[PDB]
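hiii so my PI (J.) wants the whole complex modelled not just the main chain, which honestly fair. so below is everything: two entries, each one labled with what it is. i double checked the lines twice but i was tired so who knows lol
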Amino acid sequence: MKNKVQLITYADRLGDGTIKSMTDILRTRFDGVYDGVHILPFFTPFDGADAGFDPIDHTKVDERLGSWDDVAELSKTHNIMVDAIVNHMSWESKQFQDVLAKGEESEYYPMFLTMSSVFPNGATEEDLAGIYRPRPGLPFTHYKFAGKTRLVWVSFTPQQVDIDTDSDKGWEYLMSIFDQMAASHVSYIRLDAVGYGAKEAGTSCFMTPKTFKLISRLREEGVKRGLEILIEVHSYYKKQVEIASKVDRVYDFALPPLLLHALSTGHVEPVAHWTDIRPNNAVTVLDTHDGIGVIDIGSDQLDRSLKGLVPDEDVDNLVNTIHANTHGESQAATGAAASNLDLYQVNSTYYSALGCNDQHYIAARAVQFFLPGVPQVYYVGALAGKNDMELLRKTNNGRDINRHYYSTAEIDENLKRPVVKALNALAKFRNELDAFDGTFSYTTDDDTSISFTWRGETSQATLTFEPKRGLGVDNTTPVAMLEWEDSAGDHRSDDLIANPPVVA
Amino acid sequence: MKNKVQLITYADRLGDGTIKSMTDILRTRFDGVYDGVHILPFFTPFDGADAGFDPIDHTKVDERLGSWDDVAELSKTHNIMVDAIVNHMSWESKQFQDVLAKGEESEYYPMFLTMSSVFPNGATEEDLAGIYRPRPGLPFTHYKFAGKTRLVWVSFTPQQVDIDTDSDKGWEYLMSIFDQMAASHVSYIRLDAVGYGAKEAGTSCFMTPKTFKLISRLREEGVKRGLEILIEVHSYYKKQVEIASKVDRVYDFALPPLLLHALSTGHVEPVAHWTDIRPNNAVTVLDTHDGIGVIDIGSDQLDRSLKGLVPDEDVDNLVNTIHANTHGESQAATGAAASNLDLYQVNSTYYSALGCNDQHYIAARAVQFFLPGVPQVYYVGALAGKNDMELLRKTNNGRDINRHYYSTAEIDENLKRPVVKALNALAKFRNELDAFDGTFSYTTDDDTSISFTWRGETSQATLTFEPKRGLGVDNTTPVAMLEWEDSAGDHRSDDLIANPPVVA
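here's the output for the full assembly
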């Protein structure tokens, strides 16, 4: 994976509404800033039950957004990452509709999981209560197969029916997706919700050895097609650490909340510890298209004796701090407060989670960019966006608070903001200084500060992060300083917003 | 049960917000209009997860609303109906909390239903898939009993934990409720969601023979205490017809949608047929505190070959007509559009469902009052209230569209409206003419009109209902005429709004 900053975006929420428009925005407003892009699900349809993650036809671009040729055109200037939704599909798919109509007489009957598919001889309370769930309630919903009521396995919305990834029909479907991407100039594949892909009676059905087998098989199929794979796994941190050695890349989901913790409390020890044990074959982020994950650093939900990267007390304080910083906005969008698929992810834009503090935000991005891994910036964060309460009101979908629709006009106005210019400059710096393609090292001043250093072919840079320099949502004191050497001398910025770094 | 019109109301949504104020409003604004009252759950708390139906302490009046003394005061002038929430209680109740803390060591462990309680030897998909549900999804949620994750039975919100009505502790609790009501001057008891009260592996767990046993046992306890029982059952109409012979009263839930059908299409034959087979030991309504039930007249949900009171196409047209008449308001509050416990009830005030046609509305009330049974008028309907979109957008609870908070000031403002004056006059008429305590008969002019007649000791009255006279939400032609004889001779009203009937 090219070691350049990538943008995560919906094709219709950045620009006029199409892949063409999104491409124009990338090329004319973010040239040299974002050299790659993860286009969130743009298949048919992109506006269903779960904003693209419930595809009727995963291999067909929603014609309202564009075509595969638009993706091909985009590939000329940007490396592209696309999702491979391997765990489920829309109940409106031709395949599932056939099952509803013909039941067991459907050739697609084996393609979908039902309670009986996994528990042919029935299940005890323990069996069902043991299935890992990101929210309360069992992963089953009612559907009539040729008139007979059946309990179909559904990990997320009831409209997303889980497929049997070990069935012939299911595997054929997954390979059709891989073939399409390999033929459409896609460079990277994001295995969506892969941790749920394998079901087995008596197990948690989440990140088990059976799941590892699925992941390994999918990786092999990727290799055969020249595709690198990134897996999405929101879990107890140790599961991320263990699975990372088996895949090209994993997301670093611990950093986002660890930084919110550090910026709010001034404690950097947790960040130092994570730097020491974290998987380095990562894709770093602050914000994603979902809510801010907190169980990603807390204790194991299935076994609380296994503590996280910080005490659960600190996770709870972190959550309340976000609610405080957003003046209740995140409280109105999180968990049971609105429509959500995850009870604990905190729904809020990252900028709003920090109380819109520019110095804290640019510092968080700086730390993200300095940790080993390919960095990704979510489009809302790329424009330092605030919570969209109007969108939340309209849809009542918790995550929409962090999914604002940015018109071209709004993008241009936001590009004038000091913090946005600062981020564009920082990303450009991260793409142009060759130090980042060299060796990494770090030192820490006992829970007070941490310095990240990169030494490359013709340059080097050291980022010093000291949150205690500017606690408070109204803080204007920089909490990160950057020293670097390039072909044009030895430089230093003590304020990434007033003095953004520029490579000679 | 006295054969006088009753009002259904929340103690805090009619007046200043207390039982005392609600009482004052009844006595000073509705004297002679509403002689009885069903006070919706006013226990601790009244503003929890399901507006009173998730009690922490069913025997304690919420201190913010008043006290049992206030109920005693009210009883001096009005017969009171109160709910006996026999199927579940709040998860915040002392009993359930004790179970969460001590698990099996809690003396209340047997009081609550879990998957294992009902399925001790495990369950097959068929066992679980067959459980009747008013909406998709299994009736279970996760709770930790002394650290151990358990699947607790929850028919409605996850906060309303179902009790084992067959357990000693469960029965003791239910009897504590009956005892409290008998000691607090309550006259009538409404058995809330009693149809769900009995669970048995292999059955639908809804209105089954085991359910009948529970209903019969509860009726006996009511009889022993001098309390009459009304059971709430939303189901295929035949279930209501059959259970009626075993209880004092059942609700007439078929009439509301049948009248919407009659008023929108002009067809009265369905009403004639229902008049012929309906249980006459009923409590009649148009609107309730919940949504308008339509499966109450449609085909059976389990076996669709068991037809309803009108063709399925007509039920579908009825639903679409309500959504159309409210210009999308009811669609925004119904089903998966908002938080709901029932997927098919249509959330809209009855007046709004009729496109606010006064003549249609007063005619519907006249028919309601002319069919055998004790009439109840929901407070929103008592004030011919329109959909409350302001409240709906604030709570996102679908049923709130039909739960407006009426200040005393707003009540007086609405009492000036001709349609509201007409309803007050009609209810008074229904309470003063002794014809309604006499013999009932009816004639019909083949699907065009139906005339209901009551002949009493010193009076007689005939209501002629003919929707065809004035179809359309915008029509001003009366669709009901009333003729009657009292001590002052023969009388006639050809417009219940312009010329309300007054007993001489």
